Design a protein around this nucleic acid. Structure first.
Ligand SMILES: Nc1ncnc2c1ncn2[C@@H]1O[C@H](COP(=O)(O)OP(=O)(O)OP(O)(O)=S)[C@@H](O)[C@H]1O
Ligand SMILES: Nc1ncnc2c1ncn2[C@@H]1O[C@H](COP(=O)(O)OP(=O)(O)OP(O)(O)=S)[C@@H](O)[C@H]1O
Ligand SMILES: Nc1ncnc2c1ncn2[C@@H]1O[C@H](COP(=O)(O)OP(=O)(O)OP(O)(O)=S)[C@@H](O)[C@H]1O
Ligand SMILES: Nc1ncnc2c1ncn2[C@@H]1O[C@H](COP(=O)(O)OP(=O)(O)O)[C@@H](O)[C@H]1O
Ligand SMILES: [Mg+2]
Ligand SMILES: [Mg+2]
Ligand SMILES: [Mg+2]
Lengths: 546, 348, 329, 325, 174
DNA sequence: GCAGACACTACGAGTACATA
């Protein structure tokens, strides 16, 4: 017991007394010259390892250019749109309407191989433009104008030039604008252009996606890749089971180049029979995958299907995958926008409360790291997706959408701030000082709009009364005091409407509120005409005074 | 012009309420050695009117000749940020919170160039200039720390009048350097007298019942009371005692948001309330006022043994909102905590 | 002949005019005699006289003609980044010490770098001051002025000799205020000056500002306690009694009414927290109730220091003290 | 001759024998110097322990005064140490010979924790490739701000806090060189308030000698403003032994008379709490409440309310300790 | 990046074991004629923590400073690794043993470690500790909450003791 | 002897990120 009723004899003591007055005592005291990827690279169309639908679509898209390039009439879901694009006809300048074939997918699938093989198969000469070039817009323009706007030096019998632009995702936005300018110049384009990227959702390729023949690469089929690795190992005199090759294929995430390089390192010549444990070892062949956002959100919000059933393994897997994804703010926005639409079993809302506490913890960490220049506070917000995985683990199949609420909220807030700054700029400086824009927004906007809309009958000005004319003059004066006016707007339905030149109705009005009676067309036109003649007579009065 | 601007008093002898404070402020600024001023009080109490009356007492009538001055201020990131200042030949009005988080650059550069130069004319003008810093409670603490040495170095040639709503957001170094002038809200009788004198100056008759209801609904805000009285005269020229008073749209939207909160306690209703709070935040409504309106409406639907916990939760999440940067997280956290508490109270 | 506010009219022009800070005044007077002045760190509450003491010491060490050559003042009103410390401070610290006083008074063989408001200086910019202070200590001295010593890094804390400025006691503050009122030919009663030194809470700048403002409001006659109470924003005790009666009633509607009446009257929430604490620690409540009410008062004061809304913090504090007062009933 | 210097710079250990505490580390570095096998050093520890003075004494021992400017390249946090400085002046100093006399050169990077990670990653092969030509000494207060590659490349010596039994002879040397009248309790107050910091020991000694003229316990605790241990014992007795009002009055009177600060009171009460045989839950509650009160004092708060909360944190646990029995 | 790693055979090296470092240390000792004992080489391995550079540096420092390799000569110039005691500090915090956790904290405080290094080692231990997942998450959140206060400017022994007391409470508050 | 062209470095500007 830490508390003694009797005082200590030898050790030092400190007295404790309660409110009722009883003392307590506490103790104070050339086979060997080339790589295996280069040796077994495909040189014909029949030995490609990609999906056959993508190869056929790219070959048919490149054979639609034979009308304008080779001068011959005869060449010899996501699938439905591509089949519609191959049969939608040609433009009046005898060219396809999509002049760029855009190739996207994860690395090691064969996009560059498919582009080069399909270009050499259709009788073109491959012009390669990669990320090791200068990529400045002047050099980009010069290279594309050299590749696409001239004939061949060899004359008749010379191969046409098909421009293949590798790594277009890393290109600057001005280079993409140069490519789109030479794409849509009506100096007319006559040669096909192929663009290859690893990420289709790059910000620089947004306008390129709406104009190109988008060919998304699926991951390679494990049976075909296992057969190709078996053929490569049989050519090199190496023995391997289908099981260990399938283990290598699922280890390398269906990467052809990584699997062949891993086999080239693992075989050598000391041993022939490859073992399962060498592939299962993490020392050779494991590479850090850049996981997508939707895979991370699925891995967080859905448990894996049935070892791997331990909770700590899922904890570390979710943490490492969310760290390896990158773009942490987008992950946090997806977690914030997707965790309430799940089939939540927590009806007491405690999990939602502690998830929002974790989100506020991440926000406070971001603010403190960006305030005190102490960026060692950013090792904790990687544990936010694993917190959401622990709280909201389910065996169901959730529908994850892309986060858009916070960005739309920021865009609308910026638009409303611009509208507020436009509204206060028209007011006179004598009345600008009397109220802040915040107080004018909170107090003097909806009531001001109630002032500016009186109960006015559709009657001409000559039949009005004295009170009606005084009220109309006061209304026009108060409308001119805040630099407000009504102007016509054109509608697609065919009618004309009058609207405020600063549209301050959207600053005030809200969607779920009951509707109020608006001013009619005749009254608003009369108000605008009265504002114009009030400006005219104000100029006349200013001329008469001065 | 509206009724908020047409009948504003010009000098300290024409103020309808706080007349003893008006005489004290007249006696304060007569000699010219008065210190820096911190005019604080609730919104719509009449702080800016008394500041302009103090400027009318110091200089002549030329302080009413105002003009818009546009200033371009360079950040340390070399980004040009535009701010606007209202200035006269005798004073300047600056709102540094319009620059956002770069208000410290505005204090360090724009105010120091004003304070470091004396006035051109010393006969029509006095020996010192006045700088009006409006809404200093919205300033960050870095800008307030930049403010304090300029207030002491150049206080013989440049005086400062700081205006705010709450002095708790003002740091104690700034509050130690200035005299705090408290302007309370006008009472129901004062607002009724002001509205009656405005209606008598307009040739109208205002009943005592309608004036009392306008004073009660305005929450002792004379600006909003005058705006509501002019809206009631555009809506109906016979001033009836039981005439309806128009309401602001964001207040009734907040009331319907809180009614949607108390109607159902589900994550789907939480998503709908988050959408409503996004709609409130996009219209440039401050989130502390959203918290105040939510607490003002949620406590009407609570029982007597539940209101204290909801008020403590609202204060805690508003403090976390002030500490943080994304308001929607703390707003949804407060709504989720209230939904959990309300479900626990209803099921037990 | 322009009038000047009394905080600048009665600023200490010498070390002997500094009040109540006896240890640092003795150290600075020994440095006036010719002793070895170390690097200084001044911290404490606002208005205790950290800036005026070092400015008076510098103007007594160097005089009028050498104040522009030996004193470099950098504060938060000017830009103090990492490059300002690397260029402006370091090149000033490497300058030669030359120039002599023309009045025959002795001059110390160093410069003084005054870094006022060192809280706002970043941790990276504070790290560049370390070897600048160590290497150039033969020819310059450094005085750091701050309010919170935790906002200065531990190497700069270890490098400077720390001097904490205490809040001024009632005797010294009353003596200084009576001397200022004697020199300004104004009269103030003993109850008025007692309430003034109770209100000012050791802030002599606040006391001088309140005395000057009460002189201007009064006009020249006797300054009573009522003008001091009205000019300080002190909440009347009837409002505090009404708040505690609404808490003893156990109803939240009267609590909302008294909170709205105190907010609409413009009373600052810090003053209300101080007065509620003064009533709470000096009544017949039990120890547990007083304990959690004072802890809630500390939490509310912390939240008000971080710029939270006054209405919600005051209604949360009132709900807590209402629960404590109605728990035993 | 006499110089106008602070006593932390007037009395600096120019030789390695004038340092007091880390005898094993200094003996190993001296045997590194005598055998001419000096490795890349990483000196880390709390401030004021003698990391800069050690490498300055080593640099003065290795090199003469007629060759010191071309043999030692000393860069600290007051200088620009970006990645263009690593690729520029540091690499050109490391990759070249000397001018006057042949020998290995030294690069002293004081306050190496303030360097960027790009510069630290660029420093790796400069250290590794030119080991025979130059040596690099890294000084920091935080080992976590130096990358593990530079921690592997340099052998690390921890310059820990100086024990108070070893700070006494150096303080006595400074006292007998400055003609200071000091008693035994003044020395105990110096070595207690220093807490393993020789810099602030000399700072408190100089400020107390200038402020009062003698260095005793009362003069040190008056010039520093630190509370006496009897005052802390009285505060703990009042907080644990009587009601809220009398404890508040007595602690407020003690703080008004002695001129105490709540930060040092909180620090000494925190030190006193672990010595008192509290229950575990009471100790956890007291530590959490005292950490909350210490965090609240870092902003513009009222110290009286925080003092009342400090009293409250023990007035809560009075009944719990007594009812534990 | 992933395209570069696909273009290369990615080899991953693990930390060297005790015998693998010990063989190279025996080679260096037999090349340098260094007198030694077994427990001194075990101390060199313990201070190495899988690093051959640190093993060679500690061996050369112990041989130059003392001329003999036993445990006391190694531990007089080298140091025990930091997280090897932070692990049992976190273990005591799991069982709500505040006294032993504060004993380890005060022992690390008196050796001169800054609060940032101590809380970094605390987070490093808590990241891979063997306990419940929700308890680990709230532990990490409390560590980040204290680290924000440490980076804000307040960093004392009372703050670390309050962090340890909060970590002990998080166990007793299910 | 003076106007036009060539590349030269210093400087302005835009953008990313900072943890384990
Ligand atoms: N059928 C195949 N059999 C064997 N190796 C192949 C086969 N198809 C492609 N490869 C090789 O696998 C690799 C495919 O990568 P590439 O097509 O050059 O580039 P990519 O597939 O677009 O991926 P990135 O984004 O450029 S890294 C190359 O090394 C090819 O030689
Ligand atoms: N100890 C004092 N003796 C005499 N006058 C004082 C004293 N303290 C303050 N004053 C007066 O109050 C004014 C303010 O003094 P300051 O030196 O600015 O206080 P401070 O320590 O700088 O406050 P902060 O922390 O900078 S906000 C001075 O100009 C004097 O008029
Ligand atoms: N071991 C020591 N022996 C004698 N005097 C010392 C010792 N350590 C520090 N000092 C004194 O304190 C002064 C500063 O010592 P420094 O070497 O600068 O300490 P430091 O370890 O470099 O601390 P940091 O990390 O650079 S702030 C010296 O000039 C001496 O006066
Ligand atoms: N003494 C008074 N008499 C009549 N109207 C007043 C008086 N004081 C203020 N008002 C009106 O109340 C409103 C208060 O707004 P303002 O003066 O900007 O104070 P605040 O800055 O507190 O909102 C003003 O529009 C003004 O017309
Ligand atoms: Mg490729
Ligand atoms: Mg100051
Ligand atoms: Mg140093």
């Amino acid at each position: 017991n830490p508390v003694l009723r009797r005082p200590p004899i030898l050790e030092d003591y400190v007295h404790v007394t309660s409110t009722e007055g009883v003392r307590a005592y506490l103790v104070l005291r050339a086979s060997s010259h080339c790589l295996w990827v280069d040796e077994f690279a495909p040189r014909h169309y029949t030995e490609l390892l990609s999906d056959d639908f993508t190869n056929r679509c790219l070959l048919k898209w490149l054979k639609l250019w034979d009308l304008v390039v080779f001068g011959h009439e005869r060449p010899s879901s996501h699938e439905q749109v591509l089949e519609e694009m191959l049969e939608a006809g040609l433009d009046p300048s005898q060219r396809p309407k999509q002049k760029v074939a855009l190739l996207c997918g994860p690395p090691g699938l064969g996009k560059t191989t498919l582009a080069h093989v399909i270009a050499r198969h259709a009788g073109y000469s491959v012009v390669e433009m990669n990320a090791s070039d200068d990529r400045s817009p002047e050099v980009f323009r010069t290279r594309i104008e050299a590749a696409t706007q001239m004939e061949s030096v060899l004359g008749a019998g010379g191969k046409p030039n098909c421009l293949v632009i590798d790594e277009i995702d890393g290109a600057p936005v001005a280079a993409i604008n140069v490519l789109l300018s030479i794409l849509n110049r009506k100096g007319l384009l006559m040669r096909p252009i192929i663009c290859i990227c690893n990420d289709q959702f790059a910000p620089s390729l947004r306008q390129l996606k709406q104009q190109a023949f988008l060919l998304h690469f699926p991951p390679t089929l494990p049976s075909r890749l296992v057969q190709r690795l078996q053929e490569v190992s049989l050519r090199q005199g190496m023995r391997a089971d289908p099981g260990v090759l399938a283990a290598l294929c699922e280890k390398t995430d269906n990467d052809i180049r990584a699997c062949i390089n891993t086999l080239q390192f693992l075989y050598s010549r000391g041993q022939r029979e490859l073992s399962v444990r060498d592939v299962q070892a993490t020392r050779v062949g494991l590479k850090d995958q850049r996981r997508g956002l939707f895979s991370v959100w699925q891995e967080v919000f859905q448990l894996p299907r049935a070892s791997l059933t331990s909770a700590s393994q899922r904890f570390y897997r979710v943490l490492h995958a969310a760290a390896s994804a990158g773009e942490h703010e987008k992950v946090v926005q997806g977690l914030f926008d997707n965790f309430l639409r799940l089939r939540l079993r927590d009806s007491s809302l405690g999990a939602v409360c502690v998830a929002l506490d974790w989100l506020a913890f991440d926000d406070l960490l971001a603010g403190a790291a960006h305030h005190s220049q102490s960026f060692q506070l950013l090792r904790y917000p990687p544990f936010l997706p694993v917190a959401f995985h622990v709280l909201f683990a389910s065996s169901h199949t959730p529908r994850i959408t892309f986060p858009s609420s916070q960005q739309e909220a920021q865009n609308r807030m910026s638009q409303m701030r611009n509208l507020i700054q436009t509204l206060v700029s028209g007011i006179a400086p004598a009345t600008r000082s009397r109220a802040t824009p915040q107080a004018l927004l909170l107090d003097a906007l909806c009531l001001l709009l109630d002032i500016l809309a009186p109960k006015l009958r559709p009657v001409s000005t000559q039949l009005y009364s004295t009170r009606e004319k005084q009220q109309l003059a006061s209304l026009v004066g108060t409308m001119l005091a805040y630099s407000l006016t009504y102007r016509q707007e054109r509608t697609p339905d065919g009618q004309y409407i009058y609207r405020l030149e600063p549209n301050v109705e959207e600053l005030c009005r809200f969607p779920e509120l009951p509707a109020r009676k608006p001013l009619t067309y005749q009254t608003k036109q009369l108000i605008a005409r009265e504002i114009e003649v009030e400006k005219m007579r104000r100029a006349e009065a200013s001329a008469r005074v001065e | 012009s509206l009724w908020v601007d047409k009948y504003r008093p010009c000098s300290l002898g024409r103020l309808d309420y706080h007349k003893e404070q008006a005489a004290q402020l007249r006696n304060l600024v007569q000699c010219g050695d008065f210190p820096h001023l911190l005019v604080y009080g609730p919104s719509g109490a009449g702080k800016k009117t008394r500041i302009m009356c103090i400027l009318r007492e110091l200089y002549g009538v030329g302080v009413e000749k105002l003009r818009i001055e546009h200033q371009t201020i360079t950040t340390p990131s070399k980004k040009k940020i535009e701010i606007s200042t209202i200035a006269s030949n005798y004073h300047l009005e600056v709102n540094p919170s319009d620059a956002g988080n770069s208000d410290r650059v505005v204090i360090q550069e724009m105010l120091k160039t004003v304070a470091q130069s004396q006035q051109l004319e010393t006969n029509s003008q006095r020996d010192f200039k006045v700088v009006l810093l409006t809404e200093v409670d919205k300033l960050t603490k870095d800008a307030q720390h930049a403010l304090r040495r300029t207030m002491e170095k150049y206080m013989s040639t440049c005086r400062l009048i700081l205006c705010c709503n709450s002095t708790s957001k003002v740091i104690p170094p700034i509050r130690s350097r200035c005299l705090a002038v408290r302007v309370p809200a006008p009472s129901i009788e004062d607002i009724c007298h002001v509205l009656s004198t405005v209606c008598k100056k307009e040739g109208l008759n205002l009943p005592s019942q309608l004036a009392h209801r306008l004073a009660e609904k305005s929450c002792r805000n004379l600006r909003k009371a005058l705006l509501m009285c002019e809206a009631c005269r555009v809506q109906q020229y016979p001033f009836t005692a039981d005439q309806e008073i128009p309401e602001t749209d964001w207040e009734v939207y907040l009331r319907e948001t809180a009614n949607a909160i108390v109607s159902q306690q589900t994550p789907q209703r939480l998503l709908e309330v988050r959408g409503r709070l996004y709609e409130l935040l996009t219209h440039c409504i401050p989130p502390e006022i959203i918290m105040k309106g939510l607490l003002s409406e949620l406590l009407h639907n609570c029982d007597g043994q539940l209101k204290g916990e909801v008020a403590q939760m609202a204060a805690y999440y508003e403090h976390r909102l002030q500490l943080g940067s994304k308001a929607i997280y703390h707003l949804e956290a407060f709504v989720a905590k209230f939904m959990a508490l309300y479900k626990k109270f209803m099921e037990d | 002949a322009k009038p000047v506010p009394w905080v600048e009219k009665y600023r200490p022009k010498c070390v002997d005019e500094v009040a109540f800070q006896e240890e640092v005044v003795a150290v600075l007077k020994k440095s006036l005699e010719g002793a070895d002045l170390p690097n200084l760190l001044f911290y404490g509450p606002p208005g205790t006289g950290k800036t005026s003491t070092i400015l008076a010491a510098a103007r007594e060490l160097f005089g009028p003609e050498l104040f522009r050559l030996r004193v470099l003042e950098l504060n938060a009103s000017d830009e103090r980044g990492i490059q300002v410390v690397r260029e402006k401070v370091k090149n000033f610290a490497q300058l030669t010490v030359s120039g002599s006083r023309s009045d025959g008074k002795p001059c110390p063989p160093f410069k003084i770098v005054i870094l006022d408001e060192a809280d706002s200086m970043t941790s990276a910019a504070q790290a560049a001051l370390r070897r600048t202070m160590e290497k150039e200590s033969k020819t310059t001295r450094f005085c750091l002025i701050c309010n919170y010593v935790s906002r200065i890094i531990e190497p700069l804390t270890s490098r400077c000799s720390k001097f904490r400025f205490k809040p001024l006691s009632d005797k010294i503050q009353q003596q200084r205020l009576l001397d200022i009122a004697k020199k300004e030919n104004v009269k103030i009663s003993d109850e008025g000056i007692a309430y003034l030194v109770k209100v000012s809470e050791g802030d002599l700048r606040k006391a001088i500002t309140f005395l000057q403002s009460a002189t201007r409001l009064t006009g020249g006659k006797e300054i009573t306690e009522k003008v001091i109470t009205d000019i300080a924003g002190v909440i009347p005790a009837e409002k505090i009694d009404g708040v505690f009666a609404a808490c003893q009633s156990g109803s939240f509607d009267k609590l909302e009414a008294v909170v709205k009446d105190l907010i609409d009257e413009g009373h600052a929430a810090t003053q209300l927290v101080n007065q509620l604490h003064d009533v709470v620690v000096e009544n017949n409540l039990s120890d547990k109730q007083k304990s959690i009410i004072t802890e809630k008062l500390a939490e509310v004061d912390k939240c008000l220091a971080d710029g939270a809304d006054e209405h919600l913090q005051l209604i949360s504090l009132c709900a807590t003290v209402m629960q404590q007062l109605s728990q035993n009933c | 001759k006499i110089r106008n210097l602070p006593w932390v710079e007037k009395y600096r250990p120019q030789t390695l024998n004038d340092l007091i505490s880390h005898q094993d580390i200094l003996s190993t570095i001296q045997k590194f110097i005598n055998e001419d096998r000096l490795p890349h050093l990483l000196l880390y520890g709390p401030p004021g322990t003698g990391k800069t003075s050690t490498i300055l004494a080593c640099a003065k021992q290795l090199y003469k005064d007629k060759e010191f400017g071309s043999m030692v390249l000393e860069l600290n946090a007051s200088d620009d140490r970006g990645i263009d400085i690593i690729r520029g002046p540091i690499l050109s100093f490391a990759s070249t010979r000397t001018i006057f006399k042949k020998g290995f050169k030294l690069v002293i990077l004081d306050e190496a924790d303030a360097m960027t990670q790009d510069a630290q990653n660029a420093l790796r092969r400069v250290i590794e490739k030119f080991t025979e030509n130059t040596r690099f000494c890294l000084i920091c207060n935080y080992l976590s701000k130096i990358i593990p590659a530079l921690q592997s490349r340099c052998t690390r010596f921890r310059f820990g806090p100086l024990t108070p039994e070893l700070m006494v002879p150096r303080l006595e040397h400074v006292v007998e060189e400055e003609k200071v009248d000091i008693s035994e309790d003044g020395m105990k107050a110096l070595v207690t308030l220093s807490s393993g910091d020789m810099r602030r020991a000399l700072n408190i000694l100089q400020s107390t000698n200038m402020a009062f003229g003698k260095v005793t316990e009362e003069t040190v605790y008056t010039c520093t403003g630190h509370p006496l241990k009897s005052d802390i014992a009285n505060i703990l007795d009042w907080m644990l032994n009587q009601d809220f009002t009398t404890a508040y009055r007595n602690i407020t009177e003690l703080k008004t008379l002695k001129g105490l600060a709540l930060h040092d009171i909180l620090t000494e009460i925190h030190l006193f709490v672990h010595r008192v045989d509290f229950p575990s839950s009471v100790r956890i509650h007291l530590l959490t409440k005292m950490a909350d009160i210490e965090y609240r004092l870092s902003v513009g708060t009222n110290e009286k309310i925080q003092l009342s909360s400090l009293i409250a944190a023990f007035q809560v646990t009075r009944d719990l300790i007594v009812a534990e029995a | 990046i992933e395209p570069i790693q696909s273009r290369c055979a990615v080899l991953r090296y693990t930390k060297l074991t005790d015998a693998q470092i010990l063989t190279r240390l025996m080679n260096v000792i037999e090349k340098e004629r260094v007198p030694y004992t077994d427990d001194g080489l075990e101390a060199i391995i313990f201070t190495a923590q899988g690093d051959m550079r640190q093993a060679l540096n500690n061996l050369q420092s112990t041989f130059s400073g003392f001329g003999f390799i036993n445990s006391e000569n190694v531990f007089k110039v080298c140091d025990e690794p930091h997280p090897l005691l932070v692990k049992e500090m976190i273990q005591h915090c799991v069982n709500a043993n505040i006294d032993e956790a504060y004993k380890i904290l005060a022992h690390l405080w008196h050796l001169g470690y800054s609060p940032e290094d101590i809380i970094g080692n605390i987070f490093r231990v808590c990241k891979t500790f063997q306990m419940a997942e929700y308890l680990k998450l709230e532990f990490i959140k409390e560590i980040g909450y204290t680290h924000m206060k440490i980076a804000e400017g307040v960093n004392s022994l009372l703050q670390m003791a309050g962090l340890l007391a909060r970590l002990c409470q998080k166990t007793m508050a299910p």
